[PDB]
Design an enzyme around this catalytic site. Structure first.
Site, PDB file in Angstrom:
ATOM      1  N   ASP B  25       0.781  -1.235   0.000  1.00 35.10           N
ATOM      2  CA  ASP B  25       0.000   0.000   0.000  1.00 35.10           C
ATOM      3  C   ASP B  25       0.820   1.296   0.000  1.00 35.10           C
ATOM      4  OD1 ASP B  25      -1.609   2.156   0.497  1.00 35.10           O
ATOM      5  OD2 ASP B  25      -2.980   1.125   1.748  1.00 35.10           O
ATOM      6  N   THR B  26       1.030   1.902  -1.160  1.00 40.41           N
ATOM      7  CA  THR B  26       1.915   3.060  -1.183  1.00 40.41           C
ATOM      8  C   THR B  26       1.318   4.285  -0.490  1.00 40.41           C
ATOM      9  OG1 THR B  26       1.082   3.758  -3.293  1.00 40.41           O
ATOM     10  CG2 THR B  26       2.791   2.221  -3.295  1.00 40.41           C
ATOM     11  N   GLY B  27       0.013   4.254  -0.242  1.00 42.58           N
ATOM     12  CA  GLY B  27      -0.676   5.341   0.451  1.00 42.58           C
ATOM     13  C   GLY B  27      -0.781   5.089   1.939  1.00 42.58           C
TER      14      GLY B  27
HETATM   15  C1  3TL Z   1      -8.826   6.018  -1.133  1.00 47.48           C
HETATM   16  C2  3TL Z   1      -9.823   4.941  -0.756  1.00 47.48           C
HETATM   17  C3  3TL Z   1     -10.736   4.730  -1.958  1.00 47.48           C
HETATM   18  C4  3TL Z   1      -9.192   3.631  -0.243  1.00 47.48           C
HETATM   19  N1  3TL Z   1     -10.201   2.589  -0.197  1.00 47.48           N
HETATM   20  C5  3TL Z   1     -10.172   1.465  -0.910  1.00 47.48           C
HETATM   21  O1  3TL Z   1      -9.358   1.203  -1.786  1.00 47.48           O
HETATM   22  C6  3TL Z   1     -11.275   0.512  -0.572  1.00 47.48           C
HETATM   23  C7  3TL Z   1     -10.782  -0.909  -0.345  1.00 47.48           C
HETATM   24  N2  3TL Z   1     -12.259   0.522  -1.627  1.00 47.48           N
HETATM   25  C8  3TL Z   1     -13.484   0.922  -1.327  1.00 47.48           C
HETATM   26  O2  3TL Z   1     -13.742   1.530  -0.286  1.00 47.48           O
HETATM   27  O3  3TL Z   1     -14.522   0.589  -2.288  1.00 47.48           O
HETATM   28  C9  3TL Z   1     -15.775   1.288  -2.325  1.00 47.48           C
HETATM   29  C10 3TL Z   1     -16.879   0.446  -1.715  1.00 47.48           C
HETATM   30  C11 3TL Z   1     -18.066   1.051  -1.313  1.00 47.48           C
HETATM   31  C12 3TL Z   1     -19.094   0.300  -0.745  1.00 47.48           C
HETATM   32  C13 3TL Z   1     -18.937  -1.078  -0.576  1.00 47.48           C
HETATM   33  C14 3TL Z   1     -17.750  -1.679  -0.981  1.00 47.48           C
HETATM   34  C15 3TL Z   1     -16.723  -0.922  -1.551  1.00 47.48           C
HETATM   35  C16 3TL Z   1      -8.649   3.740   1.162  1.00 47.48           C
HETATM   36  O4  3TL Z   1      -8.825   4.744   1.851  1.00 47.48           O
HETATM   37  N3  3TL Z   1      -7.990   2.666   1.625  1.00 47.48           N
HETATM   38  C17 3TL Z   1      -7.062   2.806   2.739  1.00 47.48           C
HETATM   39  C18 3TL Z   1      -7.211   1.729   3.801  1.00 47.48           C
HETATM   40  C19 3TL Z   1      -8.039   0.521   3.456  1.00 47.48           C
HETATM   41  C20 3TL Z   1      -7.402  -0.674   3.107  1.00 47.48           C
HETATM   42  C21 3TL Z   1      -8.164  -1.813   2.819  1.00 47.48           C
HETATM   43  C22 3TL Z   1      -9.555  -1.759   2.903  1.00 47.48           C
HETATM   44  C23 3TL Z   1     -10.199  -0.571   3.266  1.00 47.48           C
HETATM   45  C24 3TL Z   1      -9.441   0.570   3.548  1.00 47.48           C
HETATM   46  C25 3TL Z   1      -5.582   2.891   2.349  1.00 47.48           C
HETATM   47  O5  3TL Z   1      -5.364   1.874   1.382  1.00 47.48           O
HETATM   48  C26 3TL Z   1      -5.123   4.284   1.848  1.00 47.48           C
HETATM   49  O6  3TL Z   1      -3.813   4.156   1.294  1.00 47.48           O
HETATM   50  C27 3TL Z   1      -5.131   5.418   2.894  1.00 47.48           C
HETATM   51  C28 3TL Z   1      -4.852   6.768   2.224  1.00 47.48           C
HETATM   52  C29 3TL Z   1      -5.252   7.937   3.104  1.00 47.48           C
HETATM   53  C30 3TL Z   1      -4.267   8.616   3.824  1.00 47.48           C
HETATM   54  C31 3TL Z   1      -4.612   9.698   4.645  1.00 47.48           C
HETATM   55  C32 3TL Z   1      -5.946  10.095   4.745  1.00 47.48           C
HETATM   56  C33 3TL Z   1      -6.932   9.422   4.025  1.00 47.48           C
HETATM   57  C34 3TL Z   1      -6.588   8.352   3.206  1.00 47.48           C
HETATM   58  N4  3TL Z   1      -4.184   5.149   3.971  1.00 47.48           N
HETATM   59  C35 3TL Z   1      -4.519   5.103   5.271  1.00 47.48           C
HETATM   60  O7  3TL Z   1      -5.671   5.243   5.685  1.00 47.48           O
HETATM   61  C36 3TL Z   1      -3.381   4.856   6.238  1.00 47.48           C
HETATM   62  N5  3TL Z   1      -3.146   6.023   7.088  1.00 47.48           N
HETATM   63  C37 3TL Z   1      -1.983   6.690   7.095  1.00 47.48           C
HETATM   64  O8  3TL Z   1      -1.020   6.401   6.396  1.00 47.48           O
HETATM   65  C38 3TL Z   1      -1.879   7.856   8.023  1.00 47.48           C
HETATM   66  C39 3TL Z   1      -2.091   9.124   7.193  1.00 47.48           C
HETATM   67  N6  3TL Z   1      -0.605   7.885   8.757  1.00 47.48           N
HETATM   68  C40 3TL Z   1      -0.639   7.706  10.080  1.00 47.48           C
HETATM   69  O9  3TL Z   1      -1.630   7.241  10.633  1.00 47.48           O
HETATM   70  O10 3TL Z   1       0.497   8.068  10.921  1.00 47.48           O
HETATM   71  C41 3TL Z   1       0.282   8.807  12.145  1.00 47.48           C
HETATM   72  C42 3TL Z   1      -0.601  10.043  11.978  1.00 47.48           C
HETATM   73  C43 3TL Z   1      -1.623  10.301  12.893  1.00 47.48           C
HETATM   74  C44 3TL Z   1      -2.457  11.421  12.758  1.00 47.48           C
HETATM   75  C45 3TL Z   1      -2.282  12.327  11.707  1.00 47.48           C
HETATM   76  C46 3TL Z   1      -1.255  12.077  10.784  1.00 47.48           C
HETATM   77  C47 3TL Z   1      -0.421  10.947  10.917  1.00 47.48           C
HETATM   78  C48 3TL Z   1      -3.676   3.595   7.055  1.00 47.48           C
HETATM   79  C49 3TL Z   1      -3.655   2.359   6.171  1.00 47.48           C
HETATM   80  C50 3TL Z   1      -2.744   3.385   8.231  1.00 47.48           C
END
Ligand code: 3TL
Lengths: 99, 99
Positions: B25-27
């Site tokens: 997951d690059t994001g």
């Molecule tokens: C962009 C979305 C479309 C993406 N979703 C999908 O691909 C999903 C599977 N698809 C999907 O939702 O399909 C639509 C659907 C609808 C109805 C029914 C079925 C399906 C997503 O958000 N997916 C995320 C997690 C995920 C994985 C599998 C299944 C479901 C969700 C990460 O992959 C994605 O890469 C995000 C990107 C992101 C970053 C920042 C804000 C918002 C989004 N990273 C994350 O959420 C990560 N957080 C981080 O990297 C944070 C930013 N860093 C961090 O927490 O460090 C400390 C910190 C704390 C506080 C503030 C800042 C930093 C997480 C995996 C740990």
């Protein structure tokens, strides 16, 4: 290019006369643009993430110019923290994970 | 290998005698493992995503064997929908985005 992952892989995108920075995100099915009005009609959609689900506007046939390579696609627009270029867009600029 | 992004870039990981499938997951800054007990001590931590912020247990020095390549790292464990291999792990298997 070849983007290492030591920092967030943020790239310049150009969506309708607007420059943004978007994160190239292999963990995103879809592409989600953060709070930037897109001319055109849309259909309602909901993406899920870590924790929850946000409501987004899906727009089809949106042209996104990604780091020098264009790509037309469905683009979701909604209250996400970053611009996210999902696999839907990433396959068109011919982007691959490499190790 | 070279993983195209036409489907989710899921890969086999081995974490402490347990095979899982994780998404490369690059994001994701961090690596997040879904509901699988890790021997060792941890410290409290919170990752944010789309929508919200989940509470996770961070574990340091966790050995993860990723698609044939090992990597030791901080691994977050908590109620995420998928195992997510974040950049923290992805830099060590020498993984790059490529277009
Ligand atoms: C962009 C979305 C479309 C993406 N979703 C999908 O691909 C999903 C599977 N698809 C999907 O939702 O399909 C639509 C659907 C609808 C109805 C029914 C079925 C399906 C997503 O958000 N997916 C995320 C997690 C995920 C994985 C599998 C299944 C479901 C969700 C990460 O992959 C994605 O890469 C995000 C990107 C992101 C970053 C920042 C804000 C918002 C989004 N990273 C994350 O959420 C990560 N957080 C981080 O990297 C944070 C930013 N860093 C961090 O927490 O460090 C400390 C910190 C704390 C506080 C503030 C800042 C930093 C997480 C995996 C740990």
């Amino acid at each position: 290019p070849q983007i290492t992952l030591w920092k967030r892989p943020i790239v310049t995108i150009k969506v309708e006369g607007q420059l943004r920075e978007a994160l190239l995100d292999t963990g995103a099915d879809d592409t989600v643009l953060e709070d930037i009005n897109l001319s055109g009609k849309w259909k309602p959609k909901i993406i899920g993430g870590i924790r929850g689900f946000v409501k987004v506007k899906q727009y089809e046939d949106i042209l996104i110019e990604i780091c020098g390579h264009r790509a037309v696609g469905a683009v979701l627009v909604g209250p996400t923290p970053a611009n996210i270029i999902g696999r839907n867009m990433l396959t068109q600029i011919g982007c691959t994970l490499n190790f």
